[PDB]
Amino acid sequence: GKLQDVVNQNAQALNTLVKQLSSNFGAISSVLNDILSRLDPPEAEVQIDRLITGRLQSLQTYVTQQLIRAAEIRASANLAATKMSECVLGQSKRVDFCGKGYHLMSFPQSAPHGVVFLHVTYVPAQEKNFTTAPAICHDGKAHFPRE
Amino acid sequence: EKGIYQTSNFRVQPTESIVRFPNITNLCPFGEVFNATRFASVYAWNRKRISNCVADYSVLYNSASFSTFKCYGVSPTKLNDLCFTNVYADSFVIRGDEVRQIAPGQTGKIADYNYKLPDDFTGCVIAWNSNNLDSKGNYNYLYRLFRKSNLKPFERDISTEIYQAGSTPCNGVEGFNCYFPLQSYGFQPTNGVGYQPYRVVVLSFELLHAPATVCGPKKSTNLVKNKCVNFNFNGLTGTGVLTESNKKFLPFQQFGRDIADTTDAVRDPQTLEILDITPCSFGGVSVITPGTNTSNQVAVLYQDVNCTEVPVAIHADQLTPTWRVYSTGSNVFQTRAGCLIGAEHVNNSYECDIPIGAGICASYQTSQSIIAYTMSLGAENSVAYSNNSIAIPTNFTISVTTEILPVSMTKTSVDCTMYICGDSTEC
Amino acid sequence: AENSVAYSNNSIAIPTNFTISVTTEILPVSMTKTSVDCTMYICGDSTECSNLLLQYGSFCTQLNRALTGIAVEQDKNTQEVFAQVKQIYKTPPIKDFGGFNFSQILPDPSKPSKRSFIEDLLFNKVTLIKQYGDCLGDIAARDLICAQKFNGLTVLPPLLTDEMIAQYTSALLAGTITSGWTFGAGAALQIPFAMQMAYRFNGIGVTQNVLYENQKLIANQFNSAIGKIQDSLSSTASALGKLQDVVNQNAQALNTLVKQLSSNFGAISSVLNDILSRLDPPEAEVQIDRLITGRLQSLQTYVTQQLIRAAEIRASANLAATKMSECVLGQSKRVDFC
Amino acid sequence: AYTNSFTRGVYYPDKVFRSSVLHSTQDLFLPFFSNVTWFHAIHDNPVLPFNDGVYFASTEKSNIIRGWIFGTTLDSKTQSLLIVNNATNVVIKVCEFQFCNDPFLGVESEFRVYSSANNCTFEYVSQFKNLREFVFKNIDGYFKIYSKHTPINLVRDLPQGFSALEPLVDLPIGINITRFQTLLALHRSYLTAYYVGYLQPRTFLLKYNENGTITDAVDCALDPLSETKCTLKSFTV
Ligand SMILES: *[C@@H]1O[C@H](CO)[C@@H](O[C@@H]2O[C@H](CO)[C@@H](O)[C@H](O)[C@H]2NC(C)=O)[C@H](O)[C@H]1NC(C)=O
Ligand SMILES: *[C@@H]1O[C@H](CO)[C@@H](O[C@@H]2O[C@H](CO)[C@@H](O)[C@H](O)[C@H]2NC(C)=O)[C@H](O)[C@H]1NC(C)=O
Ligand SMILES: *[C@@H]1O[C@H](CO)[C@@H](O[C@@H]2O[C@H](CO)[C@@H](O)[C@H](O)[C@H]2NC(C)=O)[C@H](O)[C@H]1NC(C)=O
Ligand SMILES: *[C@@H]1O[C@H](CO)[C@@H](O[C@@H]2O[C@H](CO)[C@@H](O)[C@H](O)[C@H]2NC(C)=O)[C@H](O)[C@H]1NC(C)=O
Ligand SMILES: *[C@@H]1O[C@H](CO)[C@@H](O[C@@H]2O[C@H](CO)[C@@H](O)[C@H](O)[C@H]2NC(C)=O)[C@H](O)[C@H]1NC(C)=O
Ligand SMILES: *[C@@H]1O[C@H](CO)[C@@H](O)[C@H](O)[C@H]1NC(C)=O
Ligand SMILES: *[C@@H]1O[C@H](CO)[C@@H](O)[C@H](O)[C@H]1NC(C)=O
Ligand SMILES: *[C@@H]1O[C@H](CO)[C@@H](O)[C@H](O)[C@H]1NC(C)=O
Ligand SMILES: *[C@@H]1O[C@H](CO)[C@@H](O)[C@H](O)[C@H]1NC(C)=O
Ligand SMILES: *[C@@H]1O[C@H](CO)[C@@H](O)[C@H](O)[C@H]1NC(C)=O
Ligand SMILES: *[C@@H]1O[C@H](CO)[C@@H](O)[C@H](O)[C@H]1NC(C)=O
Ligand SMILES: *[C@@H]1O[C@H](CO)[C@@H](O)[C@H](O)[C@H]1NC(C)=O
Ligand SMILES: *[C@@H]1O[C@H](CO)[C@@H](O)[C@H](O)[C@H]1NC(C)=O
């Protein structure tokens, strides 16, 4: 779904830009050639300037939204480059950076506009209760475990 | 698809339509203005005050016998709906070709030496020719030819000093290039148009800020409060609920404004009470649905509205009967996000499916129905802590999970000239 | 301060004591969720203005879709930081944690609330659905939320309540204090608290006998440092500046949007109904189109600034989620990260 | 002879009610801490220019100040305006007078002001512990007057606080004005205590309290601190 969202948002932005060409923005018609077929240049200029203003506004709105989306996908790609070098080319001690559990190794697969990581972890399973102590006294001396 | 959608907004329509004009019945002296026996010359224009009467402009502009009738900050159609402030009438006689110069921002020497309109002029200019009443050889209409400067707007200059036009003075004497500043119109019944006399009346007023005495022939109505009505207070149209107020207006004030430049307080013209004005009930509607692949059942959330004020907020019986499945009933439930209608409130807790807000979610469960519940955070658990026990694991599990990340997006370009202009060289 | 190191080729300095330190780090997670009804902002109730607004296309569909995207991202921001574990670990009944005293950060057992003492101090310092339905009487007509509401501007509530967020933080605390770092990797495994502290001392390169021999000094230093945090929050009034900044920026942007409704943008009046009372539709259209163009420009400026602010608070919430999982569910070796 | 104003000469600039806001206004005002000319009398009244508007104050206890003469040349070649206060009304008259050299009123009323009233176009009539303040304005054929009166306790000069002037009357007199002159009532009729300031185009920031009253203002071109206050739209920095 994260990869399908990127395809959907961009197809939707292009479809909105195409559909804004049927707005007249206060002119007599949205069709430039129908304005040119009915009017002479000194008062056809009044209609064509309205159409020009509306279409320039539509394009500038599209380009601003593209710059903000591009900044978000640049941060996602920086994170994926860090995960490639820290989980596929090494073993990582950062908690939850390369899966859930204790990280052993990771494998990359390619996807359309993206990357899938397969993380292999160690998860402890079947626990028992025990009695425990911090130290052990033998001959007036305290003994601590080495590991 | 399954989700929750903002779709439109609800808005209760007004119930009555009131009009509140001052109780007055006198008629305005427009016969004494238009049907005067002798008008004034243009360098000495006559200014008459009009006050405290009922004016019916439609008689004037419909039953015209007029040639020019131009209204400037106002339309002639609306003139019988407004009330007016500081109404004045100017009146003079000029030549036919010089009717052109009585307009905002215009040259000539009627407009420059005799009578100047301002640029922010509100009012009307009325003209009609008068050759039957202003003929023979008539030499009783003077105008000025030479001044030193240009006049200000609404400034009258009546003084005949000898215009010095050389370098040497002329002390009360007509002499070398020293002229008498007024020269008479040479009217005859034998001229062509452009030299025949015209009679001109200029009305001028302010609109909609101050208390008013002059207005139009429409009848007042009762004052209805605590309901949504369509009011009119001396020309100020609007919509809302009216309520008694504690604002003390000073006597030169009639309206009050907000920070959005919105009229929120008004003084009644007949009673002298101060009322406050507030719009009707409104809000957003959200529609909770499963997929249309699944059902055609919906629940509706009226956002931050109390549940007993909904059949006021949407109107009861101005909409279709298929909007009154979703206005009262038994599936009516009050959340902190507003009022929810059409869902059954259960007492369990689940993982969230369709979020509503402030802890409430919704799902399509069991036949089938739509339910609303408080969501659960997770399974309750407890640790067996003591000061000398430990738990050690005896086995393990090898786990494999996935993580998906976006890397790149689609590269696009636009050809600006083909988007904006197509293949038009003028564009 | 100017300083100098006494470097030599056969000299070393070794420390002979230590200090237990407790410090504070504050991070923004989410911002206020808003919506605009554009037809009520641009046109009010006027159906003439409303029919003229259809000539400009789908600009309001576009603006509403941008604000709905921001509003959904705020609830994702909060889930990502606080819902990391799915077991609600209950507070342990008898507090015997080797001399370490956690009573000011745990929720109080007599009161049925979920907030701790320090969370109470924090919620009484940021000066921020209830005045909606109100604003009929005229003493409630000088506050700013009714003038926002009457022009189509709305505030939406968060999906998780404050009580729910405090239940999440209570469960994360109970898990750490009874299990160390085991509950973040799997099931929770209980260990006594001084043994947990001894192996964390081992994690920074000190032997565990240093902790067992100085256990009471270490617990006293910790209890004093918690009390100092509590005093500096209980009497100092600028500590949460990063959280107050977000509230201030949002309220200022909404106030500017409300005040732009009193510009005429080159028309005869900024009041649409006063244009409609004085003119008939062919010359009223010229004035209403100027007003429409100006108000659309004001809305588009608001929506663009909101999207850039939403991106900044999204990066801050990503950093908060990483700090939760690497400093609360583990011990970290990155220098100055925790 | 001079004094200084400190704050005096602010008026309501429109007729709309407003409460609990700040508002920015550009109009013709008298600046703060200007020096104003002082005319006193112990035992003259010259012609003074008009200069886009005039602030006028006068304190009195025995009713010496009565009306003014406005006009451009004051010598029967152009029109002029006359305002005269009587025992129980006021007489406004636009008319081509020939004014005396030192006009006054006698002990009972002796109109020793003019000598030939001719071509008379407009005429109007309607109904130290006393201070009265006036603002006169002459824009595009009108004559606007703002007024306020208050009980003064002070010993020599104008007080320190804040009073805003309310509108009095608007008169369509249609003439050109350059100078003005004050009319007194002398104790003995011999044909032979007030302050004057001038208005400047300014920008002011005004505050309204809960009851719709102007209580405080900021003159935006006084000093850099108030320029900061006007840029920020607040009284607190
Ligand atoms: C109002 O009256 C003044 C006073 O005479 C006029 O100012 C004079 O204008 C003439 C223009 O030719 C100059 O030569 C004089 O020097 C001016 N005198 C003074 C004292 O300023 C002024 O022009 C008049 N205003 C209008 C609009 O006519
Ligand atoms: C370790 O010991 C504790 C304490 O005896 C066990 O916790 C109890 O578990 C039973 C389930 O069989 C519950 O009914 C009790 O309520 C628990 N007691 C407490 C105080 O929580 C725990 O199950 C033991 N662990 C293992 C793996 O056997
Ligand atoms: C540790 O867990 C594994 C489960 O992954 C146990 O292996 C299972 O043992 C049972 C009984 O011997 C078999 O029926 C299953 O088929 C085994 N699974 C697999 C994948 O081989 C293992 O026995 C456990 N070890 C201990 C000591 O408990
Ligand atoms: C290490 O530092 C601690 C301070 O944190 C010392 O403890 C203090 O010792 C003095 C004198 O014995 C007492 O007056 C203080 O009250 C102690 N403070 C606390 C918190 O107990 C400790 O003595 C130092 N140890 C060494 C070996 O230098
Ligand atoms: C843990 O710290 C708290 C500090 O808030 C201690 O609580 C106070 O203890 C004193 C006794 O010296 C009482 O007089 C106060 O009423 C307590 N305050 C509160 C808010 O309960 C608490 O006693 C400490 N825990 C232990 C075991 O000493
Ligand atoms: C003016 O007089 C004519 C007749 O001389 C009459 O027909 C007309 O109605 C009058 N108009 C007004 C406004 O009195
Ligand atoms: C006319 O207005 C006056 C103003 O107070 C009011 O007293 C009177 O009742 C009104 N007349 C009618 C018939 O309403
Ligand atoms: C509609 O729903 C049914 C049942 O889930 C599904 O089989 C069908 O494919 C859906 N329609 C489309 C167009 O996906
Ligand atoms: C809704 O109205 C009822 C009756 O006026 C009131 O008791 C209730 O408190 C209201 N709801 C809220 C959320 O205030
Ligand atoms: C849910 O529980 C409450 C008890 O507080 C009860 O009043 C209510 O009727 C229950 N709802 C249903 C549907 O049984
Ligand atoms: C106005 O009066 C002040 C009062 O001290 C004085 O400083 C200033 O010089 C005066 N103005 C002029 C132009 O002299
Ligand atoms: C002034 O007041 C007296 C007192 O009654 C009155 O007779 C007179 O008409 C008034 N006007 C003038 C111009 O004297
Ligand atoms: C003004 O008065 C004089 C004499 O008093 C007269 O001759 C003239 O016609 C009057 N009117 C003017 C100049 O408009």
Ligand SMILES: *[C@@H]1O[C@H](CO)[C@@H](O)[C@H](O)[C@H]1NC(C)=O
């Ligand atoms: C505003 O008016 C109220 C009601 O008369 C009064 O109580 C209050 O004192 C007034 N405010 C001021 C500043 O005088």
